[PDB]
Amino acid sequence: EWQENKSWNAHFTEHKSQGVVVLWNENKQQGFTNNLKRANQAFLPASTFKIPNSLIALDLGVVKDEHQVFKWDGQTRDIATWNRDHNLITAMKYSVVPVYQEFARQIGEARMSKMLHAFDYGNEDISGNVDSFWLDGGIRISATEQISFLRKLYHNKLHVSERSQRIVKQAMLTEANGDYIIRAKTGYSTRIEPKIGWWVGWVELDDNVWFFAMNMDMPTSDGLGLRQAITKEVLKQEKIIP
Amino acid sequence: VAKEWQENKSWNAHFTEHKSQGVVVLWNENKQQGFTNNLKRANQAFLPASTFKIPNSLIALDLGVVKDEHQVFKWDGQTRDIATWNRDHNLITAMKYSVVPVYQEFARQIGEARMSKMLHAFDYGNEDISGNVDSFWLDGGIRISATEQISFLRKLYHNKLHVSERSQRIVKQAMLTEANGDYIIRAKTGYSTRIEPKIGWWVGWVELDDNVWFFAMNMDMPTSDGLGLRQAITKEVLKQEKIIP
Ligand SMILES: *C(=O)N1C[C@H](NOS(=O)(=O)O)CC[C@H]1C(N)=O
Ligand SMILES: *C(=O)N1C[C@H](NOS(=O)(=O)O)CC[C@H]1C(N)=O
């Protein structure tokens, strides 16, 4: 079920980086990783938590649909794209923290905890602030647990409406062309060490789905582009993407 | 400039330079304003050909002929000219490779009575299903203009069509052509080859962060040499208008 393919380390080494890329071939029901230990190492999900947060908010009616406008609070933040009104699509695209913080507060501790349990999401521990537990609280999820979670989302098997799962998968749309479709979410766990970068999601091909979850050491924001770059090098090596 | 429809003849450069003739029709969803290089051709009704895969997919999902976007539609075993058709398909791939046999079967299952009722409810072009139940969109009575394609597409985009919200969401997912950090294109190509004038189609929309640009283009297609011009000329217009980089 889980093969260790150490050749992918070359992609990390060539990029002066370290981390794990985890791939899951849906058709074959087989997994591949350059590091089995790191693949099962649970980390703070950071912005990858916007996937279960969106799902819960949609199912509870906190988010009516992907067109609902979430007004900017007027607070100027470091990331320029957050300093405007957003809908679910753009909030996911620009990883708009205050929008997701508001969703989490509206969901509340009790429903957030019990609904995440329904998703079997990582350690299912929401300890810390309702609006920041995914960044500096007790929640932890491994790259293999991200895959397990994403596979349920792909198949509409999470215990939420099909509609909510379709809206999130639409909001996860990152890239598409004649060769593949990528539905994914980036993350950057900046608050608690080890500071890590995430990229979780999948690649849809005509006749298969390749699920992926990657994390890498991110001591600074300088290497953030490597989350997609390294994953893409692995996908290209495995002939998943041309 | 405050007008609902504006003609922009400068776009004709994109057709002429490519030794082509046609119409591109754009609709700025936010401003509720339309733009075209040819007002007359924008309203000229043609056979929808493969663009009919959008309403056909909608009807088939709503009626449960297509359970979901994963349902496998087996290859009948007949070898056809377009290689990609000679294999099993789901709604995503059938739309992607415009697999005619799959859609002919859908239409036959839907039947003429339900097909007619659905198109009238969709206000789809002239709503005329005359001809073969499995070919009317290629050689029958159905006619739709580029502007009527946009009207139909706007309702689909907003889940305003009479069929289920679910069928509309699945069809828009199946329409996914291209996506990146700047835009998302949800569209369907067409090539009306049976009844003159032989024409190429490209209908759909461009999703931006804060706007949607609906488009419908058709162009003369005397040879398959110009097929790539359907997307290329549209993209030249979208680039000229600063819609896409
Ligand atoms: C999410 O992890 N964060 C919000 C935002 N996301 O950008 S990212 O998806 O490319 O990682 C910035 C980083 C991080 C945060 N500072 O909370
Ligand atoms: C649809 O109009 N057709 C099926 C197929 N479509 O490819 S297209 O979307 O690029 O136009 C080939 C042409 C046409 C047909 N022969 O029926």
Swiss-Prot record, chain A:
Positions of the catalytic residues: S47 (acyl-ester intermediate)
Superkingdom of the organism of origin: Bacteria
Effect upon mutating S47A: Does not alter thermal stability
Binding site for a beta-lactam: S47, K50, S95, R227
Enzyme Commission code(s) on record: 3.5.2.6
Pfam family, one: Transpeptidase
InterPro entries in alphabetical order: Bact_Transpept/Beta-Lactamase, Beta-lactam/transpept-like, Beta-lactam_class-D_AS, PCN-bd_Tpept
GO process annotations (BP): antibiotic catabolic process; cell wall organization; response to antibiotic
GO MF annotation list: beta-lactamase activity; penicillin binding
Regulation: Inhibited by avibactam, related diazabicyclooctane (DBO) derivatives and by bicyclic boronic acids, via a covalent binding to Ser-47. Inhibited by chloride, bromide and iodide ions. Not inhibited by the beta-lactamase-blocking agents, clavulanic acid or tazobactam.
Modified how: Carboxylated on the epsilon-amino group of a lysine, with the resulting carbamate functional group serving as a general base. Probably N-carboxylated at Lys-50 at neutral pH in vivo and undergoes complete N-decarboxylation, at pH 4.1, in vitro.
Inducing or repressing factors: Expressed from an upstream promoter, P(out), in an insertion sequence IS1999.
Modified residues (N6-carboxylysine): K50
GO cellular component, one term: plasma membrane
Catalysed reactions, as listed in the record: a beta-lactam + H2O = a substituted beta-amino acid
EC category: hydrolase
Entry keywords, A to Z: Antibiotic resistance, Hydrolase, Plasmid, Signal
Record note on quaternary structure: Monomer. Dimer.
Family statement: Belongs to the class-D beta-lactamase family.
Xref: NCBIfam families: bla_class_D_main, blaOXA-48_like
Function (record text): Class D beta-lactamase which confers resistance to the beta-lactam antibiotics, including amoxicillin, and moderate resistance to cephalosporins and carbapenems such as cephalothin and imipenem; in the DH10B strain of E.coli. Acts via hydrolysis of the beta-lactam ring. Has oxacillin-, cephalothin- and imipenem-hydrolyzing activities.
Note: When OXA-48 is present in clinical isolates of K.pneumoniae, increasing chloride concentration during antibiotic treatment reduces bacterial growth.
Full protein name: Beta-lactamase OXA-48
